[PDB]
Structure formats: structure tokens, C-alpha cells
Design a protein around this nucleic acid. Structure first.
Ligand SMILES: [Mg+2]
Ligand SMILES: [Mg+2]
Ligand SMILES: [Mg+2]
Ligand SMILES: [Mg+2]
Ligand SMILES: [Mg+2]
Ligand SMILES: [Mg+2]
Ligand SMILES: [Mg+2]
Ligand SMILES: [Mg+2]
Ligand SMILES: [Mg+2]
Ligand SMILES: [Mg+2]
Ligand SMILES: [Mg+2]
Ligand SMILES: [Mg+2]
Ligand SMILES: [Mg+2]
Ligand SMILES: [Mg+2]
Lengths: 103, 48, 109, 118, 142
RNA sequence: GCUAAAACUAUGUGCCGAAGCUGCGGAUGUAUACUUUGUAUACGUGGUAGGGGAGCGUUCUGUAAGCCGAUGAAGGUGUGU
RNA sequence: GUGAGGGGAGUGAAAUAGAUCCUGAAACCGCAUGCAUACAAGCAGUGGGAGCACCUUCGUGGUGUGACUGCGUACCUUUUG
């Protein structure tokens, strides 16, 4: 059985016991997060495609923690124009473990 | 307080002298503010 | 457990010596000695001298048996170069490089 | 005093560029003048490709959804319209994943889209 | 990541047989190229070959519209000075129909090693018989 | 490669399409509010010649008869952060 | 070869401290191991991505390599360019 949820301006297809990384959230470590807006639920042969959302479907997850992705370098150079600029970046993320899916 | 390593001047009393021709990042690299060619770009390029 | 012999300062270019070194790399001591004996190259004499020194070391210092020894490792390295001047036409002068090489031979069972 | 030798700092700065130029061919990984240019161009390429990647992956998802829809007897352009008129908001990435890994669910989505179209 | 590309080891290649009698060359070639590249499968991957084998029979019966039978000309160049060789569709379809289909589908396939790999899966025969009965191809109309 | 077009004319539904706009996360300049003073709101942040602001490293002088160092300093070469 | 050079032994805290002898970077030149490479056309990278070798806390892990694929004509000066 799998479900479709929304987080951080993006959609994710998840199953029970899956660990994933999403845009940074304000929840604390060890907290429980409930997604009550489930677009799709599929269980073997029962398929629910909520028009905006599936009524009654809920997905529960646990917040493992927060972290930063690997560094990325930004480079800009305009040849023959005496212009150079650079900058680093590290994106924040929150780690979630899917603990429950219910239709 | 009152130690040879605990004395500082007032804020804004000191500034760093401009150093020309030391890279792009400084903002005054290469031509060093003199522009491109001409009399005034040369050494002692001002008119009387 | 491979014993070494090193010949330093040989008056020949490493490029030339390495052809002879490749000819014998990996082969047994007796076959390599035959090849060096019947080669007509100048580097063959130097490689023979180094290989025989290595075999003598293997026998005298480590009590190894020559019958079971093979050329396990061999390579040549560039050495200090002499500098000379060659006169040319119309007064122009040319630099001349006289190259040197080091020969390392290792024999083991 | 105020006489400064520059060897240590210059060597460190050159070594950083050489280390960043690992894996390049010939002089591009050995000679500092050549290596320095290689790193800047690589940075520019990466800056452009971080934008190109989204376009490429969107195109891939659209292709897979089109294949699934035509297998179910409909076109991609009409399936998108049917889903929008059915008020489904599943995105192209999820639709492509479903098309690749679960034919029955994608068939159900296609049926819903065509029903909304009718 | 979550979007998975097809693994070449896991690809299956089916075999289809197509009769070209009384069909338009270009509109047949588009479908042939599509099936050779694998766009029809939901596991399409631009850097992997996921197509099927296509056998074409009765190739010399392929048709063209208008006056193209006499007016469509095929060119090649030997790298010798002034070495330009020039022919016509009427003669080419009588001589080497396989060349007709090969040019038509090559023009539509990608130009590279992967395109060369894809084009090898097309088998063209003038007659109504083919030597691949062992592969048990299925009838396909396109 | 294309001919009741994959051409031209007219009409109508969809769709693709950019670093444009929207969504989510982060940084920064100005102005306005708090005086619970670095926290919010609003608008901005392509750039040559130039102007303005803020910083990182290197050698020496005092702080230093101090602090580290043969249980290993400077220098050289890798790894992690 | 009573050569040059080296291998043992011995001295020395240390002998890749052995006499053009403190440390010992780079260009440049060898050897060994892993992977790739002899049907394919271009500033040599970048965004993807299969397979292989080793390590492995046996993984949505780490380190090497990079079949196939989208995009892509160096830098500095001087110029309307
Ligand atoms: Mg400026
Ligand atoms: Mg000038
Ligand atoms: Mg002027
Ligand atoms: Mg003057
Ligand atoms: Mg004379
Ligand atoms: Mg190197
Ligand atoms: Mg976009
Ligand atoms: Mg914008
Ligand atoms: Mg700006
Ligand atoms: Mg030394
Ligand atoms: Mg090959
Ligand atoms: Mg070929
Ligand atoms: Mg100008
Ligand atoms: Mg001109």
C-alpha cells in the first residue's frame, strides 16, 4: 500500500517505513506530523483518487531531525569584461520517517 | 582595562589607505581608477 | 623477499636503456642472461652488469638459490645531465645535453 | 621589518586549484594556467545545468505519461485536460512514476480523466 | 532518486512483422522509427534502447504520391573530384528497396552510437518471406 | 520526409514552451514600527568606465622573562569538517 | 676491469643524515595495481546514468572508473563589434 502526500511545495509517493528528506520544517525532533490532505491511496486493488483530496485518508510520520545538503559553488564570469563573482550554498532539509498510512 | 593590549581608538578615527591594482575583487584593479588611455592615464598625466 | 642491485651514473640515455630493460622484464634469470649475452646493444652490457650484481647479492647475502630466481622488477630512471656547447654556422651557439640513467634490478623467487 | 615572502601563500592558492582540477586530461590537471581556466568554465557549466535539469526531467515525465495514456487509448494533451476538469492535482512526476511502476492505477486515472472529458 | 531510468539488462525486445504493400513511405517510417526508439513504452529512457524488432516485407510495393516516383532523386558523393552520383526513386525501388527504407528511417533516427544501435533492429526484405520464423514475430499494422 | 498535407485560407477546442509569473526553503540593502534592540512589515538586490561601504590572509613592534613545544615547533604531503 | 656503482657488516639518536650529504615543493620522466578504450568525428567539461573492482557500521553506505545520452567554439588586451 502506498500514498501520495504534499510537502514543501512538492509531492511525494510514500510507503510505510520509508525515510525521506523534505524542505525544512519547524517541527522538533521526535515529533509526529499528520498529513490529512492525501491525493491518492492505493492498496493492492483498492484505488482512491481524491479529487482535491481523499476524505478520511491520513499519513503519519516522525521527524528524525534536520540537516544541510552538500555545498554547491556558484560561479559567474563575463569574459573580457573584468567581472567575476562567486558564492557558496547549503540547503536546509528535514528528515521524515513514514510511520503510518490509513485510507 | 588600562592595559597595553586593552586600548583602542574611537570609532571612525582610523581608515585603511586605498591600494590600487590588486585584483578584481577590490574594485580598483587593473587600471586603478585612471580610465582607459589618454594623457591623464599616464604617469604624471595632469595638465598645469 | 627480492634483492636489489642499483647501477648509478651509466653514460647512456634512459630512453635507450629502457628498450633493453623491457626486453627482459619478467623473465627467468638464465633466459635473461642468454638474451643479454647475444644482444648487440650497448645498454645490454650495463643491464648484464647490474643483473649479475643482483644475483651475486641474492646468493652471498641472502643464501638464495639462483636456479629459482626471476627478474621480478626492473626500471630505469633519468640521471644528472652534463652540459656542453656546440658551435654552429654564422656564430650561433647551441646547448648540448649528455644524459645519464640509473638502473634498478630486483630478483626474487 | 615589513619584507614579506610570498611562497607559502602562493603555493597554497595554486594547490587548491590543482586539487579542484582532479580528473582532467593532460595539462588541464597538471599546469596551473590551464587548470585555472578549466575550473571556471566548469563552474559556469554547472550554473547553467542546474537550470537545464528541471526542463529535461519535465520532458521525461511528459514522455512517459504520453506513453501510458496512448496505451490506455488517449493522448497526453487530452488526459491533462481531463484531469484538470476532474480537479485532480497529481503532478507530472508522480504520474510518470505511476505509469512506470503500476499500470492498474494509471488505467484508473485515465478512466477518470476520460469520464471527466465526457 | 525517485525517477528511475530503465536498466538495459532488464529490457525485453519483442518481434513484429509489417507488410508495406500499398502504404505511404513517410507515414510508415514515422511509426517504424517510433517503435525502434521505444517511445511507445512507459519505460522510455533517452539514453537507453528500449525498442522492438521490426521486420518489413513486400518493401518494393511502397508507394509515393504526386510525381515523386519520377521527381524524387537520391544523391551520393564519391570523394573524387566531380564524383556526384545521382538516381531516381523508380529505379531505386526496383534495385534496392532496402536502401529506400534505410534512408527513410535513418533520416528520422538520432545521429550517434545509440541511433546506429537502434537502426540495426530493422530488417527489410523485398519478398513476402523472411528468415526469422524462429523468432515468432507477431503481425503489426502501422 | 509531406498532396481529402505534415501546404494555404477561415473558424474552435486542448496542449508544449523561458533564468517571465506562482509555490516552498534561505541570504542581503533601504525605509517604517517597536525601545519586550534584532525582531516584523513594504519595496528592492543584471552590469563596463567609475563612486561609496565592509572584510580575509602575509612580514615585523608592544602586550611577551607571558602561552605552546623532544610525550615533537616551523615547513612538506593526505584525510575529515 | 684492483674501474664507476651497489649489496651485506659496522658507527651513529637518525645513513631515502654517506660526503654537491638539514628539510626536499612544482614543471618533467619511470614502474605496479583498479576500471575504461580499436564502427567512431570538434575548447575535452557540465547535468544525467548502466556496468565493473575494492572497502564496508552490508545501506537510500564510502572510494576508484565511466559504456550511453541533452547542452556546450579557451583566457587576456583593444574595440561599434
Ligand atoms: Mg568598477
Ligand atoms: Mg590598457
Ligand atoms: Mg580619460
Ligand atoms: Mg607624465
Ligand atoms: Mg667564426
Ligand atoms: Mg598530479
Ligand atoms: Mg522553468
Ligand atoms: Mg524572477
Ligand atoms: Mg550588482
Ligand atoms: Mg636532503
Ligand atoms: Mg567498440
Ligand atoms: Mg555502421
Ligand atoms: Mg568600450
Ligand atoms: Mg576596426
Amino acid at each position: 500500500m502506498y500514498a501520495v502526500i504534499q510537502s514543501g511545495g512538492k509531492q511525494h509517493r510514500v510507503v510505510e517505513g520509508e525515510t525521506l528528506k523534505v524542505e525544512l520544517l519547524k517541527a522538533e525532533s521526535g515529533a509526529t506530523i499528520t498529513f490529512d490532505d492525501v491525493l491518492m491511496v492505493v492498496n493492492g486493488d483498492n484505488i482512491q483518487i481524491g479529487a482535491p483530496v481523499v476524505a478520511g485518508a491520513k499519513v503519519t510520520a516522525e521527524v528524525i531531525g534536520h540537516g544541510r545538503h552538500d555545498k554547491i559553488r556558484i560561479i559567474k564570469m563575463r569574459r573580457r569584461k573584468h567581472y567575476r563573482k562567486q558564492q557558496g550554498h547549503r540547503q536546509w532539509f528535514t528528515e521524515l520517517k513514514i510511520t503510518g498510512i490509513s485510507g | 582595562t588600562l592595559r597595553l593590549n586593552e586600548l583602542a581608538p574611537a570609532e571612525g578615527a582610523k581608515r585603511e589607505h586605498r591600494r590600487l591594482g590588486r585584483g578584481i575583487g577590490s574594485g580598483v584593479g587593473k587600471t586603478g581608477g585612471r580610465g582607459i588611455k589618454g594623457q591623464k592615464s599616464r604617469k604624471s598625466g595632469g595638465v598645469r | 623477499m627480492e634483492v636489489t642491485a642499483k647501477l648509478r651514473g651509466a653514460a647512456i640515455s634512459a630512453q635507450k636503456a629502457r628498450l633493453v630493460a623491457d626486453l627482459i622484464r619478467g623473465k627467468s634469470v638464465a633466459h635473461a642472461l642468454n638474451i643479454l649475452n647475444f644482444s648487440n646493444k650497448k645498454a645490454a652490457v650495463l643491464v648484464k652488469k647490474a643483473l649479475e650484481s643482483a644475483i651475486a647479492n641474492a646468493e652471498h647475502n641472502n643464501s638464495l638459490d639462483v636456479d629459482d630466481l626471476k627478474v621480478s622488477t626492473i626500471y630505469v630512471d633519468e640521471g644528472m645531465s652534463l652540459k656542453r656547447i656546440m658551435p654552429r654556422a654564422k656564430g650561433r651557439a647551441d646547448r648540448i645535453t649528455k644524459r645519464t640513467c640509473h638502473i634498478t634490478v630486483k630478483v626474487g623467487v | 621589518m615589513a619584507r614579506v615572502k610570498r611562497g607559502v601563500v602562493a603555493h597554497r592558492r595554486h594547490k587548491k586549484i590543482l586539487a579542484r582540477a582532479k580528473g582532467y586530461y593532460g595539462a588541464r590537471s597538471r599546469v596551473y594556467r590551464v587548470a585555472f581556466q578549466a575550473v571556471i568554465k566548469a563552474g559556469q557549466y554547472a550554473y547553467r545545468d542546474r537550470r537545464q535539469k528541471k526542463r529535461q526531467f519535465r520532458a521525461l515525465w511528459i514522455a512517459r505519461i504520453n506513453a501510458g495514456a496512448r496505451q490506455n487509448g488517449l493522448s497526453y494533451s487530452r488526459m491533462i485536460d481531463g484531469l484538470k476538469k476532474a480537479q485532480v492535482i497529481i503532478d507530472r512526476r508522480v504520474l510518470a512514476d505511476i505509469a512506470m511502476h503500476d499500470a492498474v492505477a494509471f488505467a484508473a486515472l485515465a478512466e477518470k480523466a476520460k469520464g471527466a472529458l465526457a | 532518486m525517485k525517477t528511475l531510468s530503465a536498466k538495459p539488462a532488464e529490457v525485453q525486445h519483442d518481434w513484429f512483422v509489417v507488410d508495406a504493400t500499398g502504404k505511404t513511405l513517410g507515414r510508415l517510417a514515422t511509426e517504424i522509427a517510433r517503435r525502434l526508439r521505444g517511445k511507445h513504452k512507459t519505460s522510455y529512457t533517452p539514453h537507453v534502447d528500449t525498442g522492438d524488432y521490426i521486420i518489413v516485407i513486400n518493401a518494393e510495393q511502397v508507394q509515393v504520391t504526386g510525381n515523386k516516383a519520377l521527381d524524387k532523386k537520391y544523391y551520393r558523393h564519391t570523394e573524387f573530384p566531380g564524383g556526384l552520383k545521382e538516381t531516381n526513386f523508380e529505379k531505386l525501388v526496383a534495385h534496392k528497396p532496402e536502401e529506400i527504407f534505410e534512408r527513410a528511417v535513418k533520416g528520422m533516427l538520432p545521429k550517434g552510437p545509440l541511433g546506429y544501435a537502434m537502426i540495426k533492429k530493422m530488417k527489410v526484405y523485398a519478398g513476402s518471406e523472411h528468415p526469422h520464423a524462429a523468432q515468432q514475430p507477431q503481425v503489426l499494422d502501422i
